[PDB]
Design a protein around this ligand. Structure first.
Ligand code: CLA
Ligand code: CLA
Ligand code: CLA
Ligand code: CLA
Ligand code: CLA
Ligand code: CLA
Ligand code: CLA
Ligand SMILES: CCCCCCCCCCCCCCCC(=O)OC[C@H](COP(=O)(O)OC[C@@H](O)CO)OC(=O)CCCCCCCCCCCCCCC
Ligand SMILES: CC1=C(/C=C/C(C)=C/C=C/C(C)=C/C=C/C=C(C)/C=C/C=C(C)/C=C/C2=C(C)CCCC2(C)C)C(C)(C)CCC1
Ligand SMILES: CC1=C(/C=C/C(C)=C/C=C/C(C)=C/C=C/C=C(C)/C=C/C=C(C)/C=C/C2=C(C)CCCC2(C)C)C(C)(C)CCC1
Ligand SMILES: CC1=C(C/C=C(\C)CCC[C@H](C)CCC[C@H](C)CCCC(C)C)C(=O)c2ccccc2C1=O
Ligand code: SF4
Ligand code: SF4
Lengths: 144, 742, 132, 80, 146, 146
């Protein structure tokens, strides 16, 4: 038995098909993550991603913060999660401003594509809504 | 029969002809020198036996006889030491009072004011304090007299001449054939049962009959003189039954299978001797007996001339899983037709062993009166850390010499070796990440502590008073070892070491052993250890996996093991050879081992070593500054390096002033290395041309043309001075610091 | 007609499908094991063999090992993403080490090397001393 | 790309062409030396710049010469 | 060139990160730029000299401004043997409470002690008040604009 | 060698014991012990477990210098083709990891060149060299004031 073969039956391609790369667990898991799911507007792709990241970025600021032992330990850190999201979004704006090119022909049959300038902008704004909202959601969930 | 003796008679004539022709061994150097590079090549290639001949039989004969020459130099070395202990030492005065008399086996001649190095040691004797532990080892053997040391010295000289004769006999007179060398299963049976098994049996025999009863009388308070001759312990059972009253039974409870009669000399008590602070000899006699039975039984696992036993080939070839493909097929041809692949295993094992040896000799001190000699404890520990460090990387060098020269693809289709090479980008990129992950965390813990403390915020540092990082896994294991005597080891009276907890052992007012508590300052340092080993492995592993080719150089194996580069194109090709990977990893081993011995020297001085008074008031050497001073770099720089330097820098006019000179001398050599490591050859060769001109102008020039050191060689010089100067500066700092506190 | 190989992680990257990729063809009289420039081993198939690589050097390095170690002889191709192929080694069917009538002179200075001009002479020009 | 020039002191002993790892040089007909052949650099754009050709040239000074030039993906030696 | 290095067409066509590193490090090597003539060379250097001269006077105008604004020049002029001269004040959100008390020993706020010797220099040339120091800094800001 | 000499000669004149430098300056150990080891006390006590002082910044800068100097050794001893091969495995890894595959560099990452490594290693050795002496000479004088 052999559990290691060349990816896509191409022996000279520089990839190996192992149970970490292409097994039934990792196939169905990655196919259902928002960066690869079929049937999502690029806003929605960025929303979800942002919804799941802003929620746990909270943790290390509120616990191991410079003002963690104060009566404003929750406030101190929430503000600093927003400042972290502002830096990350800023990296998303500049990346798409330079990687993709503007379109001449109004021709657009795929408005769904993510790897484009128009969709990346929507993907970037969805990340910012979902990450500030999830930062505020566990502000409520921890205030208890 | 498959295992036989095959020897060629009168293989090589013994004449002085070749001695007068330097470079006879190789084809290119035998033409003679044209440039000064020839002189350097003469030495770099002298032991490269693989590149001198193409016959595996002729390489194997050269190696075998050279082993005899290496052992003969070791016998000469051992015979010297025993000679110095018999004529230039204070052994007798030390044996009478081994708490006040310091040890010494070297005396210097008075010629340029250097007699000051003869210290006032004690016992009407003046000499240099030696820290090798010869004295303690002699007491454990039951020496007690200089006469006995003289016989060991004569016997060491005779053995040394026997080795010299055997190496000459096996290379010229009786040169054994290739079939003889390729007997792995025979060789394993002989080394396990004969060398290791009979070695432990006979040694145990010396310990039961000679070393055990003499030590009992020394410990009780009998002066050496009143102790009888060792041979008198072999004749009168009356003398032996007074100390161990189970000799009245003789040897009959051994063949009747009643071995518990001998619980007088085969103990399992653990701990240390409250009188000497060393391990119980009675435990050590049991230790060698149980070993020797294990080694002799293990030397029957292979098949030689009688059907029974295992063939090494059918073992390995049976091990193949559905991830490994062919598994271990081919590793026999490898490990029976190539000497490089053998050293790669062997040096990695022997180097790991010397590290393992150093960890077990400070925690369970096996010699008597050695645990309170802190200069010996510190010296012996670091020594094996260095010898272990060099041998480990040396295994990785030969692993890469094997991949370039002896490795063939046709002998290894789809086996474990072939497969590692196939996903070599994955081993290296994943290791690369683990290295960037371990460094940012373990070293960033110290930076955080350095900046937090400097900003006036100690409440936020990683410490035992702030954000704790408790090593809970190692603390958990300590408790298990402490509760082990009685429960898990029901016949053990005490714990193996007192490091895991227990009582405090003291000899002469000094502390021999104490429990070594682990806190967050311990925890942080253990990751530095983790981190520097992972980086060293990253360079050596990469050198072995990419020894034959890369995406950069597809034909690296045709360029060889050690080449300088493949030119200034393809960006920079400098240090692409696998020899240069060995070169870089030598600087890391250095970095890794330096932190290990720094960690050991400081933790023992802060939390173990010290003296005591009434009501058990322990006063440590540096007073317990380890939990709150080693969490920052400034604390390591100011309390370890700056504070403990006071001895070596204030040693002038005293007997330890040689340590002050070697301290400066090694700071000089270390800096001298940086001239070779930062510069390169073509600036030096143009410099030589202007110098040669001044000679040519005066009508003379050497016919051996002067040439700058080559690229590869200029790197090997700078590395040898870097190690010499670096290790040396620490050598002088460690001995002048520990002789003053012992 | 790709040789027998279990794959490896040292093969082509994105550069292949985005920038030029190279293939090499050879003919072997028998089945023998050879070393891969990016991989450890592979069994070549009798008859024509086809291998795809990522660099010209990797292709030429295999040729060198196929030449003086197996006595066989091969062709290099440059393949573009659109589909246009180029024929590279040997350029005119004859190896570069052997003179072939019909070749021309490219990049030759008709004097020895000590005969180059000073860099101050070609000042403020868009050239160099070795391009005169 | 890099620049490879060939001078007239070339004695035509084909050693640079046999050393080139990326097939940049070739031998052409020439009537100026005993071997009636001179090296030529028709494909300098595959030149990686490793200078193996100059390590092989027996003349003093060298007949073949490599000069550093603007780097492409080919002369950088990249496989990605 | 149409890439980041606009002065080297040969550095602007490089696909690697080396292009970024070199465009920075060869930016002032004016003689080696694409299409550089001799007359344009001397003009670029000349105008580069003005901008360099202005940075020096802007630098000086800084040192006059910080002491006039946050130093103890007036207190130093009165007792030049006992008071320590003041470089500028510190404002760093990363300081503990004991840091603010350690850097303000002998003063009211966090502060750096000067070791430039501008105090002794200004004292002997005539300066005696903070108003004179401030006036000198405005005159060097105007000179830098020119 | 000039700055150590000028400083050591003055520290002993100001300290009131010019004879200390007149006797110990003959051998090297004198320099190492009575100048370097003896005058670093107030600097490295800038901050410790007990607390911190005004001179904490010089103490932090002192260690800072040692670090930059030592990172300069990396660029000067280890050469390029070691590093080029390493980055090729990193380019590989990034191209094979899901969710990191959506991002991509526009400039092929490559190892610094031969001449660039010398210039960088030189800048580290230089900036580390100057900052650690500035740290020493300023706080050993201001921490003893004589
Ligand atoms: C402490 C470290 C150190 C030392 C000792 C040197 C030493 C030297 N370097 Mg230097 N170098 C260093 C670091 C150092 N380097 C570093 C870090 C770099 C940066 C890469 C360089 C870069 C460099 C270059 C570019 C140049 C030098 C040069 C020199 C030489 C200067 C001439 C001289 O001093 O003669 C005295 C010789 C010594 C001090 C060497 C030690 C000799 C000892 C054994 C003599 C013992 C004293 C006494 C004579 C004993 C008598 C002998 C006995 C048999 C009777 C000398 C060999 C230059 C040179 O080679 O010109 C000649 C040169 O051009 N070096
Ligand atoms: C890398 C080493 C290291 C570490 C661990 C820390 C740790 C810390 N520092 Mg820092 N620091 C460091 C180096 C480090 N420091 C250095 C080198 C300096 C000098 C410049 C400083 C200077 C400094 C200052 C000046 C301050 C700190 C502070 C802090 C604290 C909070 C920082 C914070 O909120 O970050 C935000 C943290 C995150 C966003 C965490 C991201 C990491 C996550 C957990 C990784 C998760 C990986 C995950 C397992 C992957 C698997 C996924 C899969 C399961 C799906 C914290 C204790 C502050 C403090 O008050 O200390 C108490 C503060 O004021 N630091
Ligand atoms: C020189 C400029 C500078 C300045 C002014 C600051 C300022 C600050 N740093 Mg910082 N830092 C700097 C450089 C600087 N840093 C550099 C170069 C490094 C790397 C070596 C660090 C590393 C560092 C660490 C590791 C930490 C800080 C922290 C802090 C905060 C002080 C602690 C406190 O009480 O906050 C407590 C904070 C709050 C009560 C809430 C503040 C929330 C901010 C203001 C939200 C900003 C929102 C906005 C969208 C940001 C946009 C950014 C961008 C678009 C410009 C403060 C905001 C600490 C911190 O972030 O605290 C959480 C901290 O842990 N710094
Ligand atoms: C019982 C048999 C026996 C013993 C004891 C040894 C012992 C040794 N062999 Mg060895 N060997 C054996 C059988 C044996 N071999 C056989 C059968 C083969 C053929 C397959 C080999 C092939 C072989 C090779 C190819 C090599 C060795 C090497 C070595 C040495 C390893 C280095 C070491 O640990 O030094 C420890 C050193 C000592 C313990 C000192 C002992 C010195 C001599 C030899 C005394 C032993 C003789 C005798 C048994 C003593 C009797 C004691 C008396 C009181 C009764 C060691 C001396 C290596 C070596 O160094 O060769 C020189 C080496 O390269 N062996
Ligand atoms: C391997 C080394 C070695 C050697 C050379 C000896 C040698 C000896 N032992 Mg022995 N012994 C050994 C290991 C050894 N022993 C070990 C490992 C143990 C413990 C398991 C003992 C336990 C032991 C006891 C308890 C006694 C001896 C005795 C003796 C002596 C007489 C034995 C005799 O003639 O029996 C005949 C020989 C054969 C049957 C063969 C003799 C000097 C006796 C003694 O000391 O007499 C004075 C005795 O009473 N031995
Ligand atoms: C059992 C151990 C062992 C053995 C048998 C070998 C054997 C060999 N090694 Mg090897 N090696 C070892 C351990 C070993 N090594 C270790 C531990 C390392 C890591 C440091 C290496 C690293 C290594 C490299 C990197 C290379 C070899 C090479 C070689 C081969 C030729 C060696 C030669 O001609 O040197 C001749 C011997 C010398 C020139 C002696 C010089 C030794 C130093 C410079 C002096 C030591 C200083 C001294 C102790 C103290 C000075 C004090 C001062 C005051 C005077 C040979 C097969 C080379 C080779 O080509 O492989 C085929 C090669 O390139 N080895
Ligand atoms: C003090 C000097 C020094 C330092 C810092 C380094 C640092 C490094 N070397 Mg080394 N090297 C040195 C000397 C040094 N070297 C010397 C002298 C040589 C010559 C022999 C080499 C030869 C060499 C080789 C051959 C190799 C390395 C490797 C490495 C890397 C280890 C991975 C790691 O943990 O990085 C993490 C960074 C650090 C540990 C240092 C800083 C830690 C910071 C403070 C925490 C995180 C900071 C954060 C990311 C940024 C915030 C700050 C910023 C905003 C201001 C790292 C970049 C290896 C490598 O790349 O493997 C991965 C490797 O193979 N080096
Ligand atoms: C550790 C995991 C472990 O021990 O698995 C063990 C696993 C067992 O493989 P096989 O059953 O194919 O091995 C059979 C023979 O090779 C045994 O000699 O080895 C691997 O698959 C290697 C994977 C690398 C692991 C990545 C890290
Ligand atoms: C560890 C582990 C793991 C993992 C896990 C994880 C990783 C998890 C995560 C999780 C997470 C990470 C989660 C998240 C969540 C989130 C959330 C829950 C959110 C929410 C939100 C909301 C709800 C909303 C908001 C808003 C908006 C947006 C707007 C405005 C308004 C509001 C505010 C409402 C596993 C399994 C592998 C295994 C075992 C171990
Ligand atoms: C230190 C030293 C030395 C010395 C050493 C010596 C002194 C040794 C000895 C050794 C010895 C002295 C050994 C011995 C051996 C013995 C043995 C090893 C025996 C055994 C036996 C047995 C095994 C038996 C068996 C049996 C039985 C039991 C029963 C039945 C029968 C039989 C017989 C089988 C020298 C000089 C070298 C050098 C320097 C160092
Ligand atoms: C200094 C230097 C040289 C010059 C060194 C040379 C030419 C070797 C000189 C060795 C001599 C000839 C051997 C004899 C040693 C001295 C004559 C005696 C000194 C020993 C004292 C203890 C007396 C290089 O050739 C070189 C090459 C590549 C990288 C760096 C460097 C480099 O740094
Ligand atoms: S520089 Fe290298 S690749 Fe270019 S022609 Fe010369 S040898 Fe060939
Ligand atoms: S350039 Fe050199 S190698 Fe090439 S043909 Fe001429 S002499 Fe031979």
């Amino acid at each position: 038995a052999n559990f290691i073969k060349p990816y896509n039956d191409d022996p000279f391609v520089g990839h190996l098909a192992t149970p970490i790369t292409s097994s039934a667990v990792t196939r169905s898991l990655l196919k259902n993550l928002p960066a690869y799911r079929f049937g999502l507007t690029p806003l929605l792709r960025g929303l979800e991603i942002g919804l799941a990241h802003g929620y746990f970025l909270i943790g290390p600021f509120f616990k191991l913060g410079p003002l963690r032992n104060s009566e404003i330990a929750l406030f101190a850190g929430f503000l600093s999660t927003i400042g972290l999201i502002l830096i990350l979004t800023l990296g998303l704006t500049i990346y798409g401003a330079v990687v993709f090119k503007e379109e001449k022909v109004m021709s657009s049959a795929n408005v769904n594509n993510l790897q484009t300038k128009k969709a990346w902008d929507q993907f970037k704004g969805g990340f910012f809504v979902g990450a500030c909202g999830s930062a505020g959601f566990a502000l409520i969930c921890l205030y208890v | 029969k498959n295992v036989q003796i095959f020897v060629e008679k009168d293989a090589v004539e013994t004449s002085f002809e070749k001695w007068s022709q330097p470079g006879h061994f190789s084809r290119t150097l035998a033409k003679g020198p044209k440039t000064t590079t020839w002189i350097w090549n003469l030495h770099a290639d002298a032991h490269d036996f693989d590149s001198q001949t193409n016959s595996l039989e002729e390489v194997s004969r050269k190696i075998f006889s050279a082993h005899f020459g290496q052992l003969a130099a070791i016998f000469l070395w051992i015979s010297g030491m025993h000679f110095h202990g018999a004529y230039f030492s204070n052994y007798s005065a030390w044996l009478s009072d081994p708490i006040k008399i310091k040890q010494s086996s070297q005396v210097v001649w008075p010629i340029v004011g250097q007699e000051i190095l003869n210290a006032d040691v004690g016992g009407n004797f003046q000499g240099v304090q030696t820290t090798s532990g010869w004295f303690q080892m002699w007491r454990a053997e039951g020496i007690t007299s200089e006469v006995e040391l003289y016989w060991i010295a004569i016997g060491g000289l005779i053995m040394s001449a026997l080795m010299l004769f055997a190496g000459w006999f096996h290379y010229h007179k009786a040169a054994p054939k290739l079939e003889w060398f390729q007997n792995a299963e025979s060789m394993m049976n002989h080394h396990l049962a004969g060398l290791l098994g009979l070695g432990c049996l006979s040694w145990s025999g010396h310990q039961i009959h000679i070393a055990l009863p003499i030590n009992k009388l020394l410990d009780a308070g009998v002066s050496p003189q009143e102790i009888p001759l060792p041979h008198e312990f072999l004749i009168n059972r009356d003398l032996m039954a007074q100390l161990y009253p189970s000799f009245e039974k003789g040897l009959t409870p051994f063949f009747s299978g009643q071995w518990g009669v001998y619980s007088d000399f085969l103990t399992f008590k653990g701990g240390l001797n409250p009188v000497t602070g060393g391990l119980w000899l009675s435990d050590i006699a049991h230790h060698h007996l149980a070993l020797s039975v294990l080694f002799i039984i293990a030397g029957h696992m292979y098949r030689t001339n009688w059907g029974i036993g295992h063939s090494m080939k059918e073992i390995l070839e049976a091990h193949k899983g559905p991830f490994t493909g062919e598994g271990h097929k081919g590793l026999y041809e490898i490990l029976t037709t190539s000497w490089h692949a053998q050293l790669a295993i062997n040096l990695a094992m022997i180097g790991s062993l010397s590290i393992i040896v150093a960890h077990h000799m400070y925690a369970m001190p096996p010699y008597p009166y050695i645990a309170t000699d802190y200069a010996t404890q510190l010296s012996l520990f670091t020594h094996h850390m260095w010898i272990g460090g060099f041998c480990v990387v040396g295994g990785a060098a030969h692993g890469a010499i094997f991949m370039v020269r002896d490795y063939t693809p046709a002998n290894n289709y789809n086996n474990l070796l072939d497969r590692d090479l196939r996903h070599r980008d994955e081993i290296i990129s994943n290791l690369n990440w683990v290295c960037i992950f371990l460094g940012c965390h373990a070293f960033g813990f110290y930076i955080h502590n350095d900046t937090m403390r400097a900003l006036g915020r100690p409440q936020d540092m990683f410490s035992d008073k702030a954000i704790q990082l408790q090593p809970i896994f190692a603390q958990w294991i300590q408790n298990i070892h402490l509760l082990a005597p009685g429960t898990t080891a029901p016949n053990a009276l005490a714990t193996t070491s007192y490091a895991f907890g227990g009582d405090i052992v003291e000899v002469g007012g000094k502390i021999a052993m104490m429990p070594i508590k682990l806190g967050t300052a311990d925890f942080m340092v253990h990751h530095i250890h983790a981190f520097t080993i992972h980086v060293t492995v990253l360079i050596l592993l990469k050198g072995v996996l990419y020894a034959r080719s890369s995406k950069l150089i597809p034909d690296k194996a045709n360029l060889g093991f050690r080449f300088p580069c493949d030119g200034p194109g393809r960006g920079g090709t400098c240090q692409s050879s696998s020899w240069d990977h060995v070169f870089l990893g030598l600087f890391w081993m250095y970095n890794a081992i330096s932190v290990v011995i720094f960690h050991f020297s400081w933790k023992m001085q802060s939390d173990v070593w010290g003296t005591v008074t009434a009501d058990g008031s322990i006063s440590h050497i540096t007073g317990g500054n380890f939990a709150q001073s080693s969490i920052t770099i400034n604390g390591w720089l100011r309390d370890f390096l700056w504070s403990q330097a006071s001895q070596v820098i204030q040693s002038y006019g005293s007997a330890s002033s040689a340590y002050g000179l070697i301290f400066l001398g090694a700071h000089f050599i270390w800096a001298f290395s940086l001239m070779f490591l930062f510069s390169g050859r073509g600036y030096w060769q143009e410099l030589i041309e202007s110098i040669v001109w001044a000679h040519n102008k005066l009508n003379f020039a050497p016919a051996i043309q002067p040439r700058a050191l080559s690229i590869t060689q200029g790197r090997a010089v700078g590395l040898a001075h870097y190690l010499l100067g670096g290790i040396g500066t620490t050598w002088a700092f460690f001995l002048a610091r520990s002789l003053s506190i012992t | 007609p790709s040789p027998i190989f279990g794959g490896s992680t040292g093969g082509w990257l994105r550069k292949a499908q985005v920038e030029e990729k190279y293939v090499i063809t050879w003919d072997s009289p028998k089945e023998q094991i050879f070393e891969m420039p990016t991989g450890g081993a592979a069994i070549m198939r009798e008859g024509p063999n086809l291998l795809k690589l990522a660099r010209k050097e990797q292709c030429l390095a295999l040729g060198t090992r196929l030449r003086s170690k197996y006595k066989i002889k091969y062709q290099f191709y440059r393949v573009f993403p659109n589909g246009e192929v180029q024929y590279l080694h040997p350029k005119d069917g004859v190896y570069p080490e052997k003179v072939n009538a019909g070749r021309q002179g490219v990049g030759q200075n008709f004097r020895s090397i000590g005969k180059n001009v000073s860099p101050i002479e070609v000042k403020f020009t868009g050239k160099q001393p070795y391009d005169l | 790309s890099h620049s490879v020039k060939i001078y007239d002191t070339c004695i035509g002993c084909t050693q640079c062409v046999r050393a080139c790892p990326t097939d940049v040089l070739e031998m052409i007909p020439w009537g100026g030396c005993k071997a009636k052949q001179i090296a030529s650099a028709p494909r300098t754009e595959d030149c990686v710049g490793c200078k193996r050709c100059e390590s092989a040239c027996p003349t003093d000074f060298l007949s073949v010469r490599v000069y550093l030039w603007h780097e492409t993906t080919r002369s950088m030696g990249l496989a990605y | 060139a149409t890439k980041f290095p606009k002065f080297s067409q040969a550095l602007a066509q490089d696909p690697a990160t080396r292009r970024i590193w070199y465009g920075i490090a060869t930016a002032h090597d004016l003689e080696a730029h694409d299409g550089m003539t001799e007359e344009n060379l001397y003009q670029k250097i000349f105008a580069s000299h003005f901008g360099h001269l202005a940075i020096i006077f802007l630098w000086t105008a800084g040192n006059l401004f910080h002491v006039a604004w946050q130093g103890n020049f007036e207190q130093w002029v009165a007792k030049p043997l006992k008071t320590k001269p003041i470089a500028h004040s510190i404002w760093d959100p990363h300081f503990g409470e004991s840091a603010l008390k350690a850097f303000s020993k002998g003063n009211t706020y966090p502060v750096n002690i000067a070791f430039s010797g501008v105090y002794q220099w200004w004292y002997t040339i005539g300066f005696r008040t903070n108003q004179e120091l401030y006036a000198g800094s405005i005159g060097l800001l105007i000179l830098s604009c020119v | 060698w000039v700055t150590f000499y000028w400083h050591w000669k003055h520290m002993t004149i100001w300290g009131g014991n010019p004879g200390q430098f007149d006797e110990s300056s003959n051998y090297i150990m004198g320099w190492l012990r009575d100048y370097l080891w003896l005058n670093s006390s107030p600097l490295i006590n800038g901050y410790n477990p007990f607390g911190m002082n005004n001179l904490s910044v010089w103490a932090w800068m002192f260690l800072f210098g040692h670090l930059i100097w030592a990172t300069g050794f990396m660029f000067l001893i280890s050469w390029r083709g070691y590093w080029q091969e390493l980055i090729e495995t990193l380019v590989w890894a990034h191209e094979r990891t899901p969710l990191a595959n959506l991002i991509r560099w526009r400039d092929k990452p490559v190892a610094l060149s031969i001449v660039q490594a010398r210039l960088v290693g030189l800048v580290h050795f230089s900036v580390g060299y100057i900052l650690t002496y500035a740290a020493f000479l300023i706080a050993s004088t201001s921490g003893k004031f004589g």
